[PDB]
Each structure stands twice: as structure tokens, then as C-alpha cells.
């Protein structure tokens, strides 16, 4: 594995503005544990699950940790957006409170959210991982302002093997990097660009840790990050997550900020 380490637990920094900001400036991320309402997260996980029962041929009697689907790509993603009530989650006062704690000022939550529901492909000789994200920076796609941050949450727990998002520690300090076409990644059948290996340094140590529902991972617009494939076996688990962007309420609201996923995709 290219993952060389865990996220640093930034939870101890929360009531110390200077320390929280210092870590974020150096590293380009914060990992905050048990800060969201677990009951709210569970309701969203259940919404995703019921969407999959309706749209992905998921077992109607499976618990969240028994749940699986044959194929991510066979599920109607537009229709899944009707099931997962993310705006109500992000804009719940308890969630907003955490966003404000991070930014130190009132926030605006993007009207776009990406939802992810990836089955394990452990054992597959020809796995379908082309729909995952290669190394990229969100600020390459989203702007013009570059002071938004991405907020990434697990809807059920992740393990090292079930995957999530890998962060290249401190890779947000030399601006936007080149993203080039990569034949091993596709989205809705179309080509995808990613940062090539000649542009992510061995010094920008790759990080991934298991996370629990209630936890959040957030990162700078120039943080270089990529998907980690689900190869869970023991236990085999879906990886269920969602990600949005948040910015100061005072900042310019661009296309991405104002446009729901279904209207832009
Ligand atoms: O979770 C993933 O696989 C990719 C996440 C991502 O690119 C993001 O949150 O910006
Ligand atoms: Fe991203
Ligand atoms: Mg049964
Ligand atoms: Mg810079």
C-alpha cells in the first residue's frame, strides 16, 4: 500500500484557534473525531440504504454492515440524490456549529454534494475501480475562489481495507497542479484527468485512517487526494460516504457552490 500513515487526530486542537489554524496551514487537513450527531449520521446512512434497496437490488433485510450491491455503476445516481437528504444534514444546527468551529466565522454550505456507495471487490480478478477518483485537487474543478474546504464524512465506519480518501500530507502549498488524462479512470463512460505520479512528492506522505460515523475529515482546495478502493474481506463492508464543500459566508459563491449535483453532472 502507498498509504504510509494515519491522519493525525486533530480533535485535541478544537478550543485553540491558533493551534488549529497552524496545523491546518502546515498540513492542509483536519481530522475531527465524534463531532457530528451520530443519530443524524445514522439517519442519512439509512436513507442511502433504502435508496439501494429501491435502486441497487440491495437485500431489504440486510443491516448496514451486511449490506452489499453488485455494481456501483448500475445504480441510478440521479435517483439516489432524491433518497439521501444531505442538505438537511449539512444545515442542521449541530453540523453548522462544527463548520463554524473550523472556519471561525459563519459559513455557506455548497448546494452540491457527492454521495458514494462502493461495494467491496476483494477477490475480483478484473475489478471495476475506474469510477474512483485519481489524485486531484478540488480547487482544480471548483472556483474561482479557493478558500472553500472539502468536508468528507463516513456514513458507516471505514476500515483500512474498505477505503475512503487518501491525503497527500502538506501537498496544498504549491498551488494548483497539472491534471492529465488517465486511461484507467472514467466517469459516466467519459475520460478523467488526474495528477500524474511525477507531480506528487514522496515527501507529501499519504495518509488514511479508519473513521467512525460522527467523524469528519476536511481539507484545503489544493490538497492532493485520491480514492482508496474497497478491498474489504474481514469483514466485507460497503464504503458509504458523502462529501461537500463549505466556505466563509462572506466569500464569492461560484457555480459549484450554487448548483446541485444533478443539475451540473
Ligand atoms: O471518497 C472518495 O473516493 C473521493 C473523495 C473526494 O475526492 C472528495 O471528497 O473531494
Ligand atoms: Fe475531491
Ligand atoms: Mg435474508
Ligand atoms: Mg498557495
From Swiss-Prot:
**What top-level branch of life does the organism fall under?**
Bacteria
Known EC number: 1.14.11.35
- Pathway involvement of the protein, from the record: Antibiotic biosynthesis; neopentalenolactone biosynthesis
Keywords noted in UniProt: Antibiotic biosynthesis, Dioxygenase, Iron, Metal-binding, Oxidoreductase, Vitamin C
What is the recorded phenotype of mutating residue 187 to Q? Answer: Strong reduction of 1-deoxypentalenic acid 11-beta-hydroxylase activity
Q: Which Pfam families does the UniProt entry name for this protein?
A: PhyH
Q: Where does Fe cation bind?
A: 136, 138, 225
Please give the positions of the paired cysteines in each disulfide bond: none
SUPFAM superfamilies documented for this protein: Clavaminate synthase-like (SSF51197)
Provide the binding site for substrate: 116, 187
Known cofactor(s): Fe cation; L-ascorbate
Q: Does the keyword Aminoacyl-tRNA synthetase apply?
A: no
Q: Does the keyword Metal-binding apply?
A: yes
- Protein family per UniProt: Belongs to the PhyH family.
Identify this protein by name: 1-deoxypentalenic acid 11-beta-hydroxylase
* Gene (UniProt): ptlH
Amino acid at each position: 500500500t502507498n498509504v504510509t500513515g494515519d491522519y493525525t487526530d486533530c480533535t485535541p486542537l478544537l478550543g485553540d484557534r491558533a493551534a488549529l489554524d497552524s496545523f491546518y496551514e502546515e498540513h492542509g487537513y483536519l481530522f475531527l473525531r465524534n463531532v457530528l450527531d451520530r443519530d443524524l449520521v445514522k439517519t442519512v446512512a439509512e436513507q442511502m440504504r433504502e435508496g439501494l434497496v429501491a435502486l441497487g437490488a440491495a437485500d431489504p433485510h440486510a443491516t448496514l454492515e451486511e449490506l452489499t450491491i453488485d455494481s456501483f455503476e448500475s445504480v441510478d445516481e440521479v435517483a439516489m440524490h432524491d433518497y439521501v437528504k444531505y442538505d438537511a444534514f449539512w444545515n442542521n444546527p449541530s453540523t453548522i456549529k462544527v463548520f463554524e468551529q473550523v472556519f471561525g466565522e459563519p459559513v455557506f454550505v455548497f448546494l452540491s454534494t457527492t454521495i458514494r456507495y462502493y461495494p467491496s471487490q476483494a477477490g475480483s480478478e478484473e475489478p471495476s475501480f475506474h469510477y474512483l477518483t485519481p489524485f486531484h485537487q478540488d480547487g482544480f474543478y471548483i472556483g474561482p475562489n479557493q478558500d472553500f474546504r472539502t468536508f468528507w464524512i463516513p456514513l458507516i465506519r471505514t476500515t483500512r481495507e474498505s477505503g475512503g480518501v487518501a491525503l497527500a500530507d502538506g501537498s496544498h502549498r504549491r498551488g494548483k497542479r497539472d491534471h492529465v488524462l488517465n486511461e484507467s479512470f472514467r466517469r459516466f463512460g467519459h475520460p478523467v484527468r488526474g495528477i500524474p505520479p511525477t507531480e506528487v512528492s514522496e515527501d507529501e506522505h499519504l495518509l488514511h485512517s479508519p473513521m467512525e460515523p460522527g467523524d469528519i475529515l476536511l481539507f484545503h482546495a489544493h490538497m492532493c487526494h485520491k480514492s482508496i478502493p474497497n478491498l474489504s474481506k474481514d469483514p466485507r463492508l460497503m464504503r458509504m460516504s458523502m462529501d461537500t464543500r463549505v466556505q466563509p459566508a462572506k466569500s464569492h459563491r461560484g457555480f459549484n457552490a450554487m448548483t446541485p449535483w444533478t443539475e451540473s453532472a
